[PDB]
Write an enzyme that holds these catalytic residues in place. Structure first.
Site, mmCIF file in Angstrom:
data_model
loop_
_atom_site.group_PDB
_atom_site.id
_atom_site.type_symbol
_atom_site.label_atom_id
_atom_site.label_comp_id
_atom_site.label_asym_id
_atom_site.label_seq_id
_atom_site.Cartn_x
_atom_site.Cartn_y
_atom_site.Cartn_z
ATOM 1 N N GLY A 115 54.886 11.808 8.867
ATOM 2 C CA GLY A 115 55.881 10.814 8.522
ATOM 3 C C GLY A 115 55.897 9.716 9.562
ATOM 4 O O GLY A 115 56.964 9.278 9.996
ATOM 5 N N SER A 196 50.320 11.458 2.457
ATOM 6 C CA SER A 196 51.683 11.179 2.913
ATOM 7 C C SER A 196 51.749 9.854 3.675
ATOM 8 O O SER A 196 51.444 8.801 3.104
ATOM 9 C CB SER A 196 52.230 12.350 3.750
ATOM 10 O OG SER A 196 51.382 12.704 4.833
ATOM 11 N N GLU A 323 55.918 18.904 -4.402
ATOM 12 C CA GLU A 323 56.055 18.073 -3.205
ATOM 13 C C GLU A 323 57.316 18.388 -2.392
ATOM 14 O O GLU A 323 57.302 18.314 -1.161
ATOM 15 C CB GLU A 323 56.066 16.588 -3.597
ATOM 16 C CG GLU A 323 54.795 16.108 -4.285
ATOM 17 C CD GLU A 323 53.676 15.876 -3.301
ATOM 18 O OE1 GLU A 323 53.907 16.124 -2.094
ATOM 19 O OE2 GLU A 323 52.575 15.439 -3.721
ATOM 20 N N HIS A 436 53.484 20.209 -0.784
ATOM 21 C CA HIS A 436 53.071 18.998 -0.089
ATOM 22 C C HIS A 436 52.046 19.307 0.994
ATOM 23 O O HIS A 436 52.286 20.146 1.874
ATOM 24 C CB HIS A 436 54.327 18.363 0.515
ATOM 25 C CG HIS A 436 54.078 17.098 1.271
ATOM 26 N ND1 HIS A 436 53.845 15.892 0.647
ATOM 27 C CD2 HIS A 436 54.068 16.845 2.599
ATOM 28 C CE1 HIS A 436 53.700 14.948 1.561
ATOM 29 N NE2 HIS A 436 53.835 15.500 2.754
HETATM 30 C C1 LIG Z 1 50.930 17.574 5.429
HETATM 31 N N1 LIG Z 1 51.908 17.326 6.506
HETATM 32 C C2 LIG Z 1 51.158 16.877 7.688
HETATM 33 C C3 LIG Z 1 52.683 18.550 6.794
HETATM 34 C C4 LIG Z 1 53.781 18.348 7.860
HETATM 35 N N2 LIG Z 1 54.857 17.423 7.418
HETATM 36 C C5 LIG Z 1 55.836 17.980 6.472
HETATM 37 C C6 LIG Z 1 56.963 18.765 7.208
HETATM 38 C C7 LIG Z 1 58.222 18.608 6.415
HETATM 39 C C8 LIG Z 1 59.469 19.243 7.057
HETATM 40 C C9 LIG Z 1 59.253 19.573 8.526
HETATM 41 N N3 LIG Z 1 58.522 18.511 9.218
HETATM 42 C C10 LIG Z 1 58.419 18.793 10.669
HETATM 43 C C11 LIG Z 1 57.714 17.684 11.398
HETATM 44 C C12 LIG Z 1 58.212 17.801 12.703
HETATM 45 C C13 LIG Z 1 57.668 17.416 13.858
HETATM 46 C C14 LIG Z 1 58.330 17.608 15.059
HETATM 47 C C15 LIG Z 1 59.577 18.226 15.034
HETATM 48 C C16 LIG Z 1 60.098 18.622 13.805
HETATM 49 C C17 LIG Z 1 59.421 18.404 12.674
HETATM 50 C C18 LIG Z 1 59.764 18.703 11.345
HETATM 51 C C19 LIG Z 1 57.169 18.290 8.656
HETATM 52 C C20 LIG Z 1 54.914 16.177 7.943
HETATM 53 O O1 LIG Z 1 54.084 15.825 8.767
HETATM 54 C C21 LIG Z 1 55.902 15.243 7.580
HETATM 55 C C22 LIG Z 1 56.857 14.863 8.525
HETATM 56 C C23 LIG Z 1 57.826 13.910 8.223
HETATM 57 C C24 LIG Z 1 57.835 13.296 6.973
HETATM 58 C C25 LIG Z 1 58.797 12.333 6.675
HETATM 59 C C26 LIG Z 1 58.807 11.715 5.418
HETATM 60 C C27 LIG Z 1 57.837 12.062 4.475
HETATM 61 C C28 LIG Z 1 56.871 13.019 4.778
HETATM 62 C C29 LIG Z 1 56.868 13.641 6.028
HETATM 63 C C30 LIG Z 1 55.901 14.605 6.334
#
Ligand SMILES: CN(C)CCN(C[C@@H]1CCCN(C2Cc3ccccc3C2)C1)C(=O)c1ccc2ccccc2c1
Ligand SMILES: *[C@@H]1O[C@H](CO[C@@H]2O[C@@H](C)[C@@H](O)[C@@H](O)[C@@H]2O)[C@@H](O[C@@H]2O[C@H](CO)[C@@H](O)[C@H](O)[C@H]2NC(C)=O)[C@H](O)[C@H]1NC(C)=O
Ligand SMILES: *[C@@H]1O[C@H](CO[C@@H]2O[C@@H](C)[C@@H](O)[C@@H](O)[C@@H]2O)[C@@H](O[C@@H]2O[C@H](CO)[C@@H](O)[C@H](O)[C@H]2NC(C)=O)[C@H](O)[C@H]1NC(C)=O
Ligand SMILES: CN(C)CCN(C[C@@H]1CCCN(C2Cc3ccccc3C2)C1)C(=O)c1ccc2ccccc2c1
Ligand SMILES: *[C@@H]1O[C@H](COC2O[C@@H](C)[C@@H](O)[C@@H](O)[C@@H]2O)[C@@H](O)[C@H](O)[C@H]1NC(C)=O
Ligand SMILES: *[C@@H]1O[C@H](CO)[C@@H](O)[C@H](O)[C@H]1NC(C)=O
Ligand SMILES: *[C@@H]1O[C@H](CO)[C@@H](O)[C@H](O)[C@H]1NC(C)=O
Ligand SMILES: *[C@@H]1O[C@H](CO)[C@@H](O)[C@H](O)[C@H]1NC(C)=O
Ligand SMILES: [Cl-]
Ligand SMILES: [Cl-]
Ligand SMILES: [Cl-]
Length: 527
Positions: A115, A196, A323, A436
């Site tokens: 993200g 993403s 997703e 996702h």
């Molecule tokens: C394909 N992927 C790579 C997978 C990883 N994920 C998705 C998860 C969604 C919920 C949890 N968190 C983590 C990210 C993070 C990092 C440091 C501390 C806490 C957390 C929570 C990631 C993402 O990298 C991701 C992170 C943020 C987003 C924000 C909006 C839309 C999509 C998003 C996708």
């Protein structure tokens, strides 16, 4: 011993054996000046020549980022965490080339997601060696700055202009234009693909005048700039830069000395405060992301898309069946990866507060009303499935569909897929379904490795997807022409045909999530 001469100097690669064959890998080539000291928060500066042989024989540092520590020891979350040292010195890219060296190979450039706060190109699921072996394409991937270090914005101010991580990506695209022919690649056949935030990045390169001549075609997996998380407004960006300044003791009156103050903080002090620049966060928070900077992005991207101001080319876009589920176990009450998360009506309502904190009471009721008038109130997983669909439709599926419609209305071929196979190796529980991010391993060809415990139907599915993606990159047409596969029709504004991707049966369907996306795209932006 394979040495390649680039415009900036010689690089040494390494040979890898892949499927009883060979791939040549150049891991960790620098493509910019390290953005250290005075260069922190600035656009990447081009690198000057070195006289030695650069050893591109290991992945480079990943950019500084916070780490997901919610489930220590658990592969489902830790597989996305960085697997090389963190450092501000992270502007490197990787090149995989087939052996024997191709003459004029099509180039696939991967932009990792997340993200915009995390990610790295060195992850195992992004390993480009299988694609280079199987399809004889060249694969390139780059690290780009993330979080505040990548996207801190005081728009107009060149000390922190915003979008720096998007400019990192763009400079790597320039590096491919100037250098990939020496590796046997065709700079005129370059396809960007990403997932993403990486897919949202690709969609923004389609809007950016500086990226127009740097690539041919685009692939967007589970993301696009019109997703509600993808672009930070000017006002919100300024409040977050100033909030970060307060939290680090850097509040000044001249904003240019605010940035000078932040340039003397240690990376870890910036990282620890990033989460708090917003009052109420969600599992989809993008604290520092793309902004309208007047440079990479000349206007609000929704306007540019609506009025046809984008690169005219073919696009391939798609989403996964579930997703939204991955985000639920990071905060929604009653949800857990370690039970079947049967939640109640009351818990569903609390989850809406988690995922829509700044939304009016009436807005949250409208979500409840549309998603909870079901067939029978008998099924106990009703509310569990509804909350995942809410998060998935709002944040990924409906924006992907609306991006594909608006893009295709200006004449270009578009192809839309719906990925609905759950990996047999998926470490998350079954109720989370086709999550996702879990089409990525099929795109990069990991199930073609028989030694890795995927089913035979999964090897076949991945082989077909790999061929479709490569045929899209080479020829603009994502067909698998030899093994009597279902033909993939173009997505048009009227019919809206899409292709389902699964192990069972490949089907042509129409108007994915028609009713739900009318709610999200027509009504909900008003609340
Ligand atoms: C394909 N992927 C790579 C997978 C990883 N994920 C998705 C998860 C969604 C919920 C949890 N968190 C983590 C990210 C993070 C990092 C440091 C501390 C806490 C957390 C929570 C990631 C993402 O990298 C991701 C992170 C943020 C987003 C924000 C909006 C839309 C999509 C998003 C996708
Ligand atoms: C702009 O920022 C203010 C302040 O955020 C506070 O200060 C930051 C350093 C950080 O610590 C944040 O977590 C703080 O919230 C936001 O204001 C607050 O708003 C909430 C609810 O809206 C309220 O309960 C608090 O009392 C407010 N605190 C202050 C100091 O004003 C404000 O919402 C931000 N603006 C936008 C548009 O998001
Ligand atoms: C499923 O689990 C959630 C999360 O709770 C945790 O994980 C469980 C596997 C178990 O190890 C618990 O000790 C953990 O609390 C449950 O939601 C929790 O419910 C309890 C009720 O005693 C409540 O006190 C907690 O606040 C809840 N936590 C959250 C995050 O909602 C949920 O009830 C479980 N559902 C089942 C078993 O069907
Ligand atoms: C959330 N609202 C939609 C943000 C709109 N703005 C910001 C622009 C830039 C600052 C000035 N005006 C005008 C709007 C207006 C209306 C009446 C009286 C005065 C003004 C100021 C608003 C952007 O979307 C934005 C932000 C950065 C940009 C950078 C370069 C080019 C365009 C850019 C556009
Ligand atoms: C490599 O091929 C170049 C032409 O390539 C392609 O042309 C563009 C327009 C796109 O349609 C691509 O998808 C095509 O593959 C030549 O101009 C160049 O000379 C060639 N270089 C070699 C063979 O070394
Ligand atoms: C680069 O790698 C080769 C390995 O064969 C080594 O000979 C050379 O000294 C290396 N150069 C460095 C580490 O600067
Ligand atoms: C702010 O400080 C910078 C750095 O010394 C200077 O170049 C700039 O002119 C100053 N602007 C204002 C408005 O004080
Ligand atoms: C096509 O089918 C053959 C079996 O006859 C298989 O070996 C090959 O890998 C398939 N190719 C694709 C792209 O699916
Ligand atoms: Cl300085
Ligand atoms: Cl109620
Ligand atoms: Cl129909």
């Amino acid at each position: 011993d394979i040495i390649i001469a680039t415009k900036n100097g010689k690089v040494r690669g390494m040979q890898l054996t892949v499927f009883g064959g060979t791939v040549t890998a150049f891991l960790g080539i620098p493509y910019a000046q390290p953005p250290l000291g005075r260069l922190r928060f600035k656009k990447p500066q081009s690198l000057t020549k070195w006289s030695d042989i650069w050893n591109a024989t290991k992945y480079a540092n990943s950019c500084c980022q916070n780490i997901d520590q919610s489930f220590p020891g658990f592969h489902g979350s830790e597989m996305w965490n960085p697997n090389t040292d963190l450092s501000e010195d992270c502007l490197y890219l990787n090149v995989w080339i087939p052996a024997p060296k191709p003459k004029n190979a099509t180039v696939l450039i991967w932009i990792y997601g997340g993200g915009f706060q995390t990610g790295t190109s060195s992850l195992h699921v992004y390993d480009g060696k299988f694609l280079a072996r199987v399809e004889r394409v060249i694969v390139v991937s780059m690290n780009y700055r993330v979080g505040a270090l990548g996207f801190l914005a005081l728009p107009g101010n060149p000390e922190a202009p915003g979008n720096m991580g998007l400019f990192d990506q763009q400079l790597a695209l320039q590096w491919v234009q100037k250098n990939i022919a020496a590796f046997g690649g065709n700079p005129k056949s370059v396809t960007l693909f990403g997932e993403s935030a990486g897919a949202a990045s690709v969609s923004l390169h389609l809007l950016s005048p500086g990226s127009h001549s740097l690539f041919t075609r685009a692939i967007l997996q589970s993301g696009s700039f019109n997703a509600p998380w993808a672009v930070t407004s000017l006002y919100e960006a300024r409040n977050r830069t100033l909030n970060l300044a307060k939290l680090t003791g850097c509040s000044r009156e001249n904003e240019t000395e605010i940035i000078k103050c932040l340039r003397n903080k240690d990376p870890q002090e910036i990282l620890l405060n990033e989460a708090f620049v917003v009052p109420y966060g969600t599992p989809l928070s993008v604290n520092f992301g793309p902004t309208v900077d007047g440079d990479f992005l000349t206007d609000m991207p929704d306007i540019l898309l609506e009025l046809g101001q984008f690169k005219k080319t073919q696009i391939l876009v798609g989403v996964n069946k579930d997703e939204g589920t991955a985000f639920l176990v990071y905060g929604a009450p009653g949800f857990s990866k370690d039970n079947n998360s049967i939640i109640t009506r009351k818990e569903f309502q609390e989850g809406l507060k988690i995922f829509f904190p700044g939304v009016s009471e009436f807005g949250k009721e409208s979500i409840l009303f549309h998603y909870t008038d079901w067939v029978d109130d008998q099924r106990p997983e009703n509310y569990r499935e509804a909350l995942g669909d809410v998060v998935g439709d709002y944040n990924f599926i409906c924006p992907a569909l609306e991006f594909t419609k608006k893009f295709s209305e200006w004449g270009n071929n578009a192809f839309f897929y719906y990925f609905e196979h759950r990996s047999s190796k998926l470490p998350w529980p079954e109720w989370m379904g086709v999550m996702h991010g879990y089409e990525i391993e099929f795109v990069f060809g990991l199930p073609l490795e028989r030694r890795d415990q995927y089913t035979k139907a999964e090897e076949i599915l991945s082989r077909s997807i790999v061929k479709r993606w490569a045929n899209f990159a080479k020829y603009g047409n994502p067909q698998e022409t030899q093994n009597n596969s279902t033909s993939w029709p173009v997505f048009k504004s009227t019919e809206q045909k899409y292709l389902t991707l699964n192990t069972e049966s490949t089907r042509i369907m129409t108007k994915l999530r028609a009713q739900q996306c009318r709610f999200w795209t027509s009504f909900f932006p008003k609340v």
